Amino acid sequence: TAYTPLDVAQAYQFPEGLDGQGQCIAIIELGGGYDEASLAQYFASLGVPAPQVVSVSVDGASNQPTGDPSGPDGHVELDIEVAGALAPGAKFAVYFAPNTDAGFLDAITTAIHDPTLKPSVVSISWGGPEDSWTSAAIAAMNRAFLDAAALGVTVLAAAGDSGSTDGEQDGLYHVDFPAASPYVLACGGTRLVASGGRIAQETVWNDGPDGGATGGGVSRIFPLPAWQEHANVPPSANPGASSGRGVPDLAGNADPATGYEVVIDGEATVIGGTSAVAPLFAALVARINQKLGKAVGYLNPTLYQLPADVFHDITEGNNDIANRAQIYQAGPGWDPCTGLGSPIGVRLLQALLP
Ligand SMILES: [Ca+2]
Numbered sequence: 001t002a003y004t005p006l007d008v009a010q011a012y013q014f015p016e017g018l019d020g021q022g023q024c025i026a027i028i029e030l031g032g033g034y035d036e037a038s039l040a041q042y043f044a045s046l047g048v049p050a051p052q053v054v055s056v057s058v059d060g061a062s063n064q065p066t067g068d069p070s071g072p073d074g075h076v077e078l079d080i081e082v083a084g085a086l087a088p089g090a091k092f093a094v095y096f097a098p099n100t101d102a103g104f105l106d107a108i109t110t111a112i113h114d115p116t117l118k119p120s121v122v123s124i125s126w127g128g129p130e131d132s133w134t135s136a137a138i139a140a141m142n143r144a145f146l147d148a149a150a151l152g153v154t155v156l157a158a159a160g161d162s163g164s165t166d167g168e169q170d171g172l173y174h175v176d177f178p179a180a181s182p183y184v185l186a187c188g189g190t191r192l193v194a195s196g197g198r199i200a201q202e203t204v205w206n207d208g209p210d211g212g213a214t215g216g217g218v219s220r221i222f223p224l225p226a227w228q229e230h231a232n233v234p235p236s237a238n239p240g241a242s243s244g245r246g247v248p249d250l251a252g253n254a255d256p257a258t259g260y261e262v263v264i265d266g267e268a269t270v271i272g273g274t275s276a277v278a279p280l281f282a283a284l285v286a287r288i289n290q291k292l293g294k295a296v297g298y299l300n301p302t303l304y305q306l307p308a309d310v311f312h313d314i315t316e317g318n319n320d321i322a323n324r325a326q327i328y329q330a331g332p333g334w335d336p337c338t339g340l341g342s343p344i345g346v347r348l349l350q351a352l353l354p
Contacts, residue, residue: 001258002270003192004046005085008253008260008280011194012312014345018287019049020087023295025282026111026119027079027092030099030126032072033065034080035265042081042263043088051088053080054117058097058107069264077264078271079125079279086283089290093117101137108178109144112153120295122148123282124184125158125275129168130177130221138177138221145183152297154285156185158274159248160215163206163321164237164328164336173217173237173327175247180219185299186247187277188338189214189254190314204317204330204337205255205272213319214254214274216337217328219244227301231334237327249300251314251338252277281343288349296352303340310347314338 003011040050055063065073076094084092095111097103104126111119130138148155159179160166166174179186193201206213218236222245233246253260259272289295318329319337328336 002261004261005082005280006046008192009086010197011192011199012252012342012345013197014086014284015287015291015349018290019089020283020286020290021089023087023286023289024091024093024117024119025083025087025286026122027094027279028107028111028124028126029076029094029096030072030104032076033063034076035065038266039080039084043085046085048085049088051084051090051092053092053094056093056095056110058095058110059103061096061098061103063096065265067265069267069269074264074271075125075275078262078276079123081262082260082276083123083279083283086280087286090286091117093119101134105137105140105144112144112148112151119153120289121154121156121282121285123156123279124178125278127158127160127176127178129166129174130180130219131174132168133177141178142181142183145181149183149298152295154185154297154299155183156187156278156281158278159186159188161212161273162215163213163319164217165322166215175217175219176215179215179247180222180245182222182225182245182300183298185281186249187274187281188216188248188251189274189277190251190338190342191255191258192253193258199312202312202314202342204314204319206317206319206321207255207257209321212273213321214251214337216319217247218336219247227304231304233334234336246334246336248339249303250281250340250343252280252342284343284345288352291349292352306351308333310344310351311340312342312344314341
C-alpha cells in the first residue's frame with residue numbers, strides 16, 4: 001500500500017481550515033538538493049497550492065541536487081513534499097550544511113536564530129546514535145535546542161530507521177541524537193492501516209534487519225526529564241540499567257510497505273521512514289500555531305500532561321531488528337517504540353486552545 005501526505009493527515013485527523021499561513025517552517029538538510037519547479041508540480045498533482053520555498057547556504061553548502069533519488073535528494077524532497085503538502089500556506093526555509101557535526105550544528109543554530117525567515121518550527125531528519133557525538137557537539141547542540149525553546153521554536157527530530165540498535169552494530173541498544181535530546185520532539189515510526197479517515201491498524205514499524213525499523217529506547221546520556229516520570233519509562237536495556245530520556249515522544253506512519261507516494265528527482269515512487277514523520281508533525285504544529293495566533297514552541301512537558309485520548313495509542317510490535325529479544329516493545333500508553341503514539345489533530349489542537 002501507500003498514501004499521499006493528505007491521506008495520512010486525514011488518518012491523523014489534522015484540523016481543517018489551517019494551511020500554516022503566517023508560519024515559517026525550517027528544514028535541515030545535510031547535502032543533496034531540491035528542484036523548485038519540480039516541487040511545484042508535485043503539489044499541483046496533489047491539488048495543493050505550491051508553498052513558497054527558500055534555500056539558505058550554510059558553511060559554504062547549498063541546494064545541489066545530484067539526481068540520485070537514493071542519495072540525499074530523496075531525503076531533501078521527501079522532507080519538503082511531506083510538510084509542504086500539509087502546511088502549504090506556510091513559508092519553507094531549507095538550510096543546507098556539510099554532512100558533519102559542525103555543519104549540522106551551524107545549520108540548526110542558523111535556522112533557529114534566523115532574523116529574517118524566522119521559523120517557528122524546526123524539522124530535522126538527520127542524526128546519529130548519541131554515543132558517537134563529541135561532547136562539544138552534544139553540548140552546543142543542546143545549547144541550541146535550549147535556545148529554540150526560549151525563542152518559542154518547536155524542534156522535531158526523526159528518531160531513526162534502524163530499530164533499537166540504531167545501526168550501531170556492537171551488540172548494545174542505542175538511541176539517536178538529536179532525537180534523544182529532551183528539548184526535542186522525537187518522532188518514531190509505525191505501520192498505518194487506515195481508510196476513510198478511520199484508523200484500522202497502527203503498529204510499530206519493523207520490517208526487519210533489512211526493511212528498517214523505528215528508532216526508540218532510553219538515552220543513557222540524558223536523564224529522565226521530570227515530565228516523563230509518569231510515562232513509565234524503563235531503564236535502558238543495556239547492562240547497567242540506567243535511568244534516561246525515553247525516546248520517542250510521538251510516532252507516525254513510516255513503514256515503506258504503507259509508504260508515501262512521492263516524486264523524487266522526476267520519478268514516481270513510494271517511500272517511508274521516520275524522516276517523513278518529523279516534517280509531517282511539523283505541518284501539524286504550524287497549523288496549530290496558525291489557529292492560536294501564537295507559536296507553541298516547546299511541547300514536550302505539555303504533551304505528557306494532556307489527556308491520553310489526545311493520542312492514538314500504539315500497543316503492538318517492537319523495534320528490535322537485532323535479535324528476538326523484542327527490545328523495545330510497544331504497550332499501553334508511552335512505550336519506547338512509538339512514544340505517546342500518533343497525535344489526533346483536532347484533539348491536540350482543542351487541548352491547546354486557551
Ligand atoms: Ca503505546
